[PDB]
Design an enzyme around this catalytic site. Structure first.
Site, PDB file in Angstrom:
ATOM      1  N   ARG F  26       1.635  -7.427  17.269  1.00 14.58           N
ATOM      2  CA  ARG F  26       1.713  -6.854  18.604  1.00 14.58           C
ATOM      3  C   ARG F  26       3.136  -6.748  19.127  1.00 14.58           C
ATOM      4  O   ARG F  26       3.358  -6.068  20.132  1.00 14.58           O
ATOM      5  CB  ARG F  26       0.870  -7.666  19.581  1.00 14.58           C
ATOM      6  CG  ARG F  26      -0.611  -7.598  19.302  1.00 14.58           C
ATOM      7  CD  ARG F  26      -1.382  -8.468  20.257  1.00 14.58           C
ATOM      8  NE  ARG F  26      -2.561  -9.032  19.618  1.00 14.58           N
ATOM      9  CZ  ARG F  26      -3.779  -8.523  19.725  1.00 14.58           C
ATOM     10  NH1 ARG F  26      -3.979  -7.439  20.452  1.00 14.58           N
ATOM     11  NH2 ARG F  26      -4.797  -9.101  19.109  1.00 14.58           N
TER      12      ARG F  26
HETATM   13  N1  LIG Z   1      -1.704   4.087  19.991  1.00 13.37           N
HETATM   14  C1  LIG Z   1      -1.197   3.221  19.086  1.00 13.37           C
HETATM   15  N2  LIG Z   1      -0.282   3.613  18.180  1.00 13.37           N
HETATM   16  C2  LIG Z   1       0.229   2.764  17.274  1.00 13.37           C
HETATM   17  N3  LIG Z   1      -0.118   1.473  17.191  1.00 13.37           N
HETATM   18  C3  LIG Z   1      -1.026   0.945  18.041  1.00 13.37           C
HETATM   19  C4  LIG Z   1      -1.629   1.811  19.058  1.00 13.37           C
HETATM   20  N4  LIG Z   1      -2.485   1.049  19.756  1.00 13.37           N
HETATM   21  C5  LIG Z   1      -2.435  -0.196  19.233  1.00 13.37           C
HETATM   22  N5  LIG Z   1      -1.568  -0.258  18.210  1.00 13.37           N
HETATM   23  C6  LIG Z   1      -1.266  -1.470  17.417  1.00 13.37           C
HETATM   24  O1  LIG Z   1      -2.413  -2.311  17.433  1.00 13.37           O
HETATM   25  C7  LIG Z   1      -2.187  -3.490  18.197  1.00 13.37           C
HETATM   26  C8  LIG Z   1      -3.282  -3.557  19.242  1.00 13.37           C
HETATM   27  O2  LIG Z   1      -2.883  -4.381  20.323  1.00 13.37           O
HETATM   28  P1  LIG Z   1      -3.654  -4.237  21.716  1.00 13.37           P
HETATM   29  O3  LIG Z   1      -4.507  -3.004  21.623  1.00 13.37           O
HETATM   30  O4  LIG Z   1      -2.644  -4.356  22.820  1.00 13.37           O
HETATM   31  O5  LIG Z   1      -4.595  -5.537  21.662  1.00 13.37           O
HETATM   32  P2  LIG Z   1      -5.851  -5.784  22.627  1.00 13.37           P
HETATM   33  O6  LIG Z   1      -6.713  -4.576  22.414  1.00 13.37           O
HETATM   34  O7  LIG Z   1      -6.441  -7.058  22.086  1.00 13.37           O
HETATM   35  O8  LIG Z   1      -5.252  -5.921  24.003  1.00 13.37           O
HETATM   36  C9  LIG Z   1      -0.818  -3.364  18.831  1.00 13.37           C
HETATM   37  O9  LIG Z   1      -0.067  -4.559  18.635  1.00 13.37           O
HETATM   38  C10 LIG Z   1      -0.152  -2.216  18.116  1.00 13.37           C
HETATM   39  O10 LIG Z   1       0.759  -2.724  17.143  1.00 13.37           O
END
Ligand SMILES: Nc1ncnc2c1ncn2[C@@H]1O[C@H](COP(=O)(O)OP(=O)(O)O)[C@@H](O)[C@H]1O
Ligand SMILES: Nc1ncnc2c1ncn2[C@@H]1O[C@H](COP(=O)(O)OP(=O)(O)OP(=O)(O)O)[C@@H](O)[C@H]1O
Ligand SMILES: [Mg+2]
Ligand SMILES: [Mg+2]
Lengths: 50, 345, 517, 469, 348, 50
Positions: F26
């Site tokens: 993340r």
């Molecule tokens: N639109 C995107 N493009 C590229 N990488 C993404 C995207 N969305 C999420 N990720 C990757 O997947 C991980 C999802 O984290 P996040 O969605 O913030 O967690 P949560 O859903 O538990 O809050 C992120 O750390 C990021 O590296």
């Protein structure tokens, strides 16, 4: 449709303030009648004219 | 539908005005009666109106009221009633000092059976012949107690019990009955009642004293020390038997709130004479003619002779509110004002 | 125009007519209170399900009785309950005001309006737990209750007095089906005939308030609030309201059923009512079972759904038709509450998310959907044009694997394939667009008679739409006498075929071709 | 006097005994002291239950490490209050209303209780106005609602925080009203990142931040959402201008209620949740709403435990929402971002009467193609693309291109791929997906549809691969 | 004197306290009147547990709404007793023995307790005998057992009611016997339909109907099968007549037992069924047997939860079943009556 | 973030056994030097799509 509903929204815009004027106009009128209601409420609670 | 909208907001505003003017008028009537009640003769008139109203509610279907058998679940109502039936003929020959030593030794036995529950366990087992428990009795305190106290202990163990503690309740109840008998033969048959009630209403105001008398770990001698001078103060406690009653209570209470335990004491005292107590309210103290009228009409209402108590509080603005048993007859003009405020459209 | 002295003299006559004479009343005391439950010492004469009055105008229901206290569920404003308050008896079990003043209103699970449109004048009151019609007080289900959805009316017909569960995952169209059913009674209400009029009751249990407002707006756009009552226990209400809401909506509409009137009731997501009862029962420390449910939750739903009945002619002949709604999770109809309600009801309409995404809307699984009343809940025209529909659809489903192998199929099998594709396209229907029964008969006639075998699959919807438009404009006699005679005689069928042929030679397909055989 | 006394201390739950007549009302805040120098503090205890015999069961908002049974407990006479007004914008607050940005700030503001009743039913009105974001999948398949309730469902680690930061970037930057963000039982690193990022974007001055994170006891995680909701309710009901409310993992609220449930003496419900799950969720979610003429556009992240959408908590959260974007780990594992499940997500305004005939028809055709592809995936896995019809192979190619074109380079994801983000208008989205459905790009490879913007990016990435639109 | 008083009311579960020497036996029926005019009735309470301290825990058969603590509870001195005899033919009863189509009918008949023991071991038949019905498909492919149990697996629109009428006819005419129908968890609409169809086919005079319906507490739905089986046992033993018993969704008997076990606070078992699932099923199914030359044969509808035949309820029911008749809609569509699936049906 | 190791990938010879599709960080490119952030730009998405 859109004509009718927007113009009835206008009629609401008018009627709201009109009826609020009526309300705060009668608010001062009703205060004259509070005394008799108070007196009769007290009379019914106690059971005598006073 | 737009016409419906404007009509409905109109009606909502009218309803708001309805309830607002209603609250204004009820506040005005509260004003009128609150500054109109100051005439003491008017308060007497309120009382007499309320009692002539009562003069037609007769009768209620109230049954007998007993202080302690209420919570006696099972196998203990029979036990305590057999014990009191034995006492009904056991007590009539005892003499005053006999009764006071009996009460002392019984509360001592109560503190004993309270301090260790392991003995009471072997003492509250059910068996139609408890001669081993009777032996334990004859070999535990026989060299330390008198004859009538060990006799009443024998006839106490002679029955089964719901639990362990109920036996201690029964024995200290016997001590209460004995102290009250001593007082009754002393001519203080009802002075004890008003003494108990007035002390209860005194203790009610102070939560400090009340709760810290319920110290479930301080030595019982510490508890009685607490009670000593706050009780032994002045003419406010002239009765010579209530001291021992209150002492027994404050030492052997077992977690019960003192504010509730002393009132339970008062109710036992009034239930000895087969009478019920009625806790009423008013604006100021009555004129005892009103007390007589109220007392006899309530005795007619409930089909049992009653005695009243007056938790006087001027926040009632006249009227009365009796609280016999568990059904209340609320007629204090304060409650009627509250009702009229609630029924407002 | 404010009715000023109206208000003045109204509250004045009230306050003059206020003589609350003081009488005895048996009272108790709150000893503990938490999470919507309050325990009350005293009240030796209180009965089970008795309403109790907590200070501040608060209401409770005595559910648990024992030798120590009364465990009561608070119906609202629980954060005002305090240890030591005085509780009064009302001497009454839960009742609700009933009457025709409830048509077009939104009320509590107590008969109290929440739409802010004034008071509701009620005929009488009705207890919530009055027993169901006896086994000898009833009558066979014989009259159809038209939902306006071709799939339901043709495959799983609902009769007056029947219970047709609507069961599906979520966002599958259950509320849409029930709202279309409610809207379809508009012509019945317009007829003015008490034998044909259907009064509707929509019970919303545990829904977002704006969703209830959207349902009410959909009902108002179609003139359906002239004969519909909404009992709303929003998601913010107590568990007691969510538990009582279907019984309130069913106490209303039983007053109508016992007056010889015909009523339709919708319990939107009885699952939430079972969840509220489970919350109450776990807070009252009653023994849990499968999925922590109290152990009389089957009784909770069967007691409610057995009050929907078709009364005998001696009792007036009224009827109450129930459309309970159940939401399943991952299409698990073997869960506890789904199993219970499937066991209780007279038929089920299963709605699938996959069918919804494929374009089949309403997303009814006609293979597993069932009505145990059956052809006894259909008019003869519908009973005749839809008898060849179920076998046709089953054959199409069996043959769907051979779609790209028509040349490798028997001629009869390719015919069945094309007919089934046409019939699947025929049972589709837009939202909030119910059809009268004569038009559904004409549509299923188009389907099963063969008059769609020449129309492209992707043009069946438009063809049926335009043909029904034509017949509504030009040939009203066919529809009128289908509606009057409840059957499709041979001359009506002949005129219908003639009209269909003329329309076909007039109709223009999307591929430029001709739909003429 | 009128003081209490600690009787039992079992984790976050504290029992307190008061004198007769001095029992505090439900939800009152009480103050106790912890004098141990390493942990000296003032515990705030919210009255949860009246136990009887003058006892009261309370939940602590701070950790009770160092609390002694018998210490004095003061009744403050009211519930927890937080500061309200225009002065809360631009600052970071506690669940109790204490400013972390600037300790001591707001102590003299107006203070509102965090416990309210929802608006009356006669004040609610359905919202059916589309909120355009610039994400192809959201604009096409789950159009958001102005003044409506939006949710982001997803398992642990799919897209929820990135997507909600993307929506803070897209909706809240050029916004003309107030924003309130509630960090509810989330990571403190992400809260600090959001604080710094709002400060740099010059959008923090219009935002009020209220944080109660994962390291807090369950009382803070229960009440922080109510605190931020009270700030947003003040901005709605008194200031009266267009609030935006963001709540990161409202599920944590629910989860906090299940951490103290059995300690409060409640028999557990089905999947280990409290019996009052739906009731507490309803009394909270019904305050997050727009009244007539007073808009609150809400956007919540909803954690789906163990990727199980049939879990009671998300299953009962579903009924409180106008639009739901559902993120799948199956879409996440394929590298598609945002990892939206197009077949499980929904929106109430995806209706021909609201979005138009062409929008609705294109969305329906996209959904139908994706559903057919999902149905064919098993055959393709076992038997191969060769045993399908020509129509089925056409549909499979179209569906792969569609599911790749739904992805997008997001503004908040540049920190993960290095590629800047893209905004696509809704008309361009509709026209592009209509062309994809008709089959106008069946000759472009599957890549060049992946993490791009509109049709110009499609042309550029196709020609960088040796293709022509 | 010797009457009890209500102490606790928790839904359908009522606790009653009696004097020290008046505790009612287990399964005894107690009477307590609800006097609220809207809900005035007489609750029957079946003693379920002896709690101690003169308390008994009972399951109520009617809804306990309106019941007050302390009201008088009268011990009848016996279990639930149903009217037995020839007079029960052509009439509808509930699990308590109250006539539904004519209230007050059968109150002067002999009454039999519904809790009975199966025939002694020396009275049982050690030899399996086939029941010659007269239907070709049954006699050939799935022969029935005299005194045995037949599962029925037909739904709506496959002629299950026609098959029930047919078996009533064949037991009344080819064996000189009687029929008892038990609607366990019966829908009131389908119960009325069965009543009307049997009256219009003129086979009601050969059948005794006992309906415990769905809108009733679980105790009635749990005891209705025993009531019908008691009537059948009187017809077999005292009249000397071959009986045919029809149990509606035997599963609903299992389900009502599970609900009663949950209400009594018993810890659940595998999947969830009451810990005494097999014991209750056996206590019921063992009374259906041949003895002293006469027999009771039983056709029982069986619901299979989730189509899982390893589920404890069908697995425990099938431990007592002797044949299976599955009514198919594919056979009903071809015009073949009875619509017995020859390949899916079986016999042991 | 999580590094999910699988025994199926371990047995296949993929060691470390990281499942690239479900593993993530993340923090992302902020936890790299500029050279690594620029050469391994979309390597995880590339391997997931592969
Ligand atoms: N639109 C995107 N493009 C590229 N990488 C993404 C995207 N969305 C999420 N990720 C990757 O997947 C991980 C999802 O984290 P996040 O969605 O913030 O967690 P949560 O859903 O538990 O809050 C992120 O750390 C990021 O590296
Ligand atoms: N027959 C139909 N044709 C086209 N669209 C439909 C149809 N029925 C329903 N829909 C659409 O499906 C969406 C969800 O349907 P609906 O809300 O009725 O489902 P539901 O069963 O109430 O699910 P939930 O209770 O979870 O919202 C609605 O937005 C509606 O527009
Ligand atoms: Mg719905
Ligand atoms: Mg997150």
């Amino acid at each position: 449709r859109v004509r009718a509903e927007q113009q009835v929204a206008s009629t609401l815009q008018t009627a709201h303030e009109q009826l609020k004027r009526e309300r705060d106009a009668v608010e001062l009128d009703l205060r004259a009648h509070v005394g008799t209601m108070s007196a009769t409420l007290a009379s019914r609670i106690l059971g005598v004219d006073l | 539908q737009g016409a419906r909208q404007v009509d409905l907001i109109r009606a909502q505003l009218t309803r708001q005005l309805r309830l607002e003017l209603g609250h204004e008028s009820v506040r005005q009537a509260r004003e009128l009666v609150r500054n109109h009640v100051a005439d003491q003769a008017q308060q007497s008139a309120t009382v007499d109106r309320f009692l002539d109203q009562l003069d037609a509610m007769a009768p209620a279907t109230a049954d007998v009221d007993y202080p302690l058998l209420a919570k006696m679940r099972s196998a203990s109502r029979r036990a305590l009633t057999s014990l009191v039936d034995w006492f009904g003929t056991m007590a009539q020959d005892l003499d005053h000092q006999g009764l006071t030593t009996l009460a002392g030794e019984l509360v001592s036995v109560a503190r004993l059976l309270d301090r260790e529950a392991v003995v009471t366990r072997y003492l509250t087992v059910p068996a139609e012949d408890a001669t081993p428990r009777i032996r334990l009795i004859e070999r535990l305190v026989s060299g330390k107690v008198g004859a009538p106290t060990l006799e009443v202990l024998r006839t106490a163990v002679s029955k089964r019990w719901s639990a362990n503690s109920d036996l201690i309740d029964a024995i200290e109840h016997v001590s209460r009955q004995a102290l009250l008998e001593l007082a009754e033969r002393a001519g203080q048959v009802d002075e004890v009642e008003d003494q108990l009630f007035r002390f209860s209403r005194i203790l009610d105001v102070q939560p400090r004293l009340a709760i810290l008398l319920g110290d479930c770990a301080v030595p019982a001698e510490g508890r009685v020390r607490l009670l000593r001078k706050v009780l032994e103060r002045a003419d406010s406690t002239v009765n010579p038997v209530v001291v021992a009653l209150l002492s027994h209570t404050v030492e052997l209470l077992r977690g019960q709130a003192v504010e509730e335990a002393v009132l339970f004491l008062a109710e036992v005292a009034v239930a000895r004479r087969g009478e019920i107590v009625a806790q009423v309210g008013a604006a100021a103290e009555l004129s005892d003619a009103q007390r007589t009228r109220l007392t006899e009409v309530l005795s007619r209402i409930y089909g049992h002779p009653v005695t009243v108590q007056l938790h006087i509080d001027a926040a009632l603005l006249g009227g009365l509110s009796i609280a016999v048993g568990d059904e209340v007859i609320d007629g204090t003009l304060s409650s009627r004002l509250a009702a009229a405020e609630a029924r407002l459209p | 125009t404010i009715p000023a002295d109206d208000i003045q003299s109204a509250i004045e006559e009230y306050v003059s007519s206020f003589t609350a004479d003081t009488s005895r009343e048996e009272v108790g005391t709150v000893v503990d209170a938490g999470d919507g439950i309050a325990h009350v010492e005293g009240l030796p004469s209180v009965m089970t399900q008795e309403l109790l009055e907590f200070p501040g105008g608060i209401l409770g229901v005595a559910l648990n009785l024992d030798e120590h206290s009364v465990g009561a569920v608070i119906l609202g404003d629980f954060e005002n309950i305090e240890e030591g308050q005085q509780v009064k008896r009302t001497g009454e079990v839960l009742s609700v005001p009933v009457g025709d003043g409830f048509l077009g209103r939104v009320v509590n699970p107590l008969g109290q309006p929440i739409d802010g449109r004034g008071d509701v004048d009620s005929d009488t009151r009705r207890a919530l737990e009055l027993q169901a019609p006896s086994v000898v007080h009833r009558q066979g289900v014989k009259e159809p209750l038209q939902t306006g959805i071709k799939a339901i009316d043709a495959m799983t017909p609902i009769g007056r007095g029947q219970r047709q569960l609507i069961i599906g995952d979520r966002k599958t169209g259950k509320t849409a089906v029930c709202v279309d059913t409610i809207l379809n009674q508009r012509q019945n209400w317009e007829s003015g005939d008490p034998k044909k009029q259907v009064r509707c009751v929509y019970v919303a249990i545990g829904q977002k308030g704006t969703t209830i407002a959207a349902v009410r707006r959909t009902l108002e756009e179609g003139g359906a609030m002239d004969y519909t009552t909404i009992v709303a226990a929003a998601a913010s209400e107590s568990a007691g309201f969510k538990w009582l809401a279907p019984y309130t909506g069913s106490a209303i509409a039983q007053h109508w059923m016992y007056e010889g009137k015909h009523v339709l009731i919708i319990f939107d997501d009885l699952t939430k009512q079972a969840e509220a009862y489970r919350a109450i029962s776990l807070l009252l420390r009653r023994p849990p079972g499968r999925e922590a449910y109290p152990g009389d939750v089957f009784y909770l739903h069967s007691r409610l759904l057995e009050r929907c009945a078709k009364l005998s002619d001696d009792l007036g002949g009224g009827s109450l038709t129930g459309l309970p709604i159940i939401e399943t999770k991952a299409n698990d109809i073997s869960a506890y509450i789904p199993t219970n309600v499937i066991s209780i009801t007279d038929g089920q309409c299963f709605l699938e998310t996959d069918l919804f995404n494929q374009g089949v809307r309403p997303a009814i699984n006609v293979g597993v959907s069932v009505s145990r009343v059956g052809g006894a809940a259909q008019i003869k025209a519908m009973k005749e044009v839809a008898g060849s529909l179920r076998l046709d659809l089953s054959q199409y489903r069996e043959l769907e694997a051979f779609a790209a192998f028509a040349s490798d199929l028997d001629a009869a099998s390719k015919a069945q394939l094309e007919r089934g594709a046409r019939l699947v396209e025929l049972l589709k229907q837009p939202q909030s667009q119910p059809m009268p029964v004569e038009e559904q008969v004409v549509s299923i006639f188009l389907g099963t008679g063969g008059h769609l075998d020449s129309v492209p699959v992707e043009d069946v919807r438009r063809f049926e739409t335009e043909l029904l438009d034509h017949m509504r404009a030009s040939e009203e006699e066919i529809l009128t006498e289908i509606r009057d005679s409840q059957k499709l005689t041979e001359e009506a069928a002949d005129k219908l075929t003639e009209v269909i042929k003329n329309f076909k030679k007039g109709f223009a397909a999307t591929g430029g071709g001709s739909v003429v055989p | 006097d009128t003081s209490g006394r600690v009787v039992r201390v079992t984790g976050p739950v504290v029992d307190v005994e008061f004198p007769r007549g001095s029992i505090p009302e439900l939800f009152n805040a009480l103050h106790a002291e912890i004098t141990f120098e390493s942990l000296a503090k003032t515990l705030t205890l919210e009255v949860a239950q009246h136990l009887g015999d003058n006892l009261v069961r309370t939940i602590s908002l701070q950790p009770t490490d160092g609390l002694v049974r018998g210490v004095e407990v003061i009744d403050t006479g009211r519930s927890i209050s937080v500061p309200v007004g225009e002065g809360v914008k631009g600052h970071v607050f506690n669940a109790l209303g204490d400013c972390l940005d600037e300790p001591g700030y707001g102590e003299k503001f107006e203070h509102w209780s965090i416990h309210r009743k929802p608006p009356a039913f006669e004040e609610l009105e359905p919202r059916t106005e589309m909120l355009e974001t610039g994400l192809k999948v959201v604009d096409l398949l789950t159009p958001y609602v102005r003044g409506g309730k939006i949710a982001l469902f997803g398992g642990a680690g799919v897209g929820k925080t990135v997507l909600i930061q993307e929506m803070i970037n897209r909706i809240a930057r050029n916004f003309g009203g107030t924003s309130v963000f509630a960090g509810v039982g989330e990571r403190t690193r992400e809260g600090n990142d959001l604080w710094v990022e709002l400060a740099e974007a010059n959008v923090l001055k219009d935002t009020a931040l209220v944080f109660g994170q994962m390291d807090e006891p369950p009382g803070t995680r229960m009440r922080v959402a109510l605190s931020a909701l009270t700030m947003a309710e003040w901005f709605r009901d008194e200031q009266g201008q267009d609030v935006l409310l963001f709540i990161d993992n409202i599920f944590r609220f629910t989860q906090a209620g299940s951490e103290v449930s059995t300690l409060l003496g409640r028999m557990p419900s089905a999947v280990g949740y409290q019996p009052t799950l739906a009731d507490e969720m309803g009394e909270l979610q019904e305050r997050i709403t727009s009244t007539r003429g007073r808009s609150i556009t809400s956007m919540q992240a909803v954690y789906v435990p163990a990727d199980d959408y049939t879990d009671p908590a998300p299953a009962t959260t579903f009924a409180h929402l106008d639009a739901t974007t559902e993120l799948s780990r199956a879409v996440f594992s394929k590298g598609i971002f945002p990892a939206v499940d197009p077949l499980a997500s929904s929106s109430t305004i995806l209706d021909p009467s609201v979005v138009g005939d062409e929008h609705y028809r294109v969305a329906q055709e996209v959904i139908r193609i994706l559903q057919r592809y999902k149905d064919l995936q098993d055959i393709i896995a076992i038997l191969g693309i060769d045993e399908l019809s020509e129509e089925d192979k056409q549909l499979v190619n179209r569906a792969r291109r569609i599911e790749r074109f739904l992805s997008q380079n997001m503004m908040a994801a540049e920190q993960f791929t290095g590629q800047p983000g893209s905004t696509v208008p809704v008309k361009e989205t509709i026209e592009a997906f209509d062309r994809l459905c008709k089959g106008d790009f069946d000759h472009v490879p599957e890549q060049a549809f992946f993490l791009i913007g509109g049709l110009d990016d499609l042309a550029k990435k196709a020609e960088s691969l040796g293709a022509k639109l």
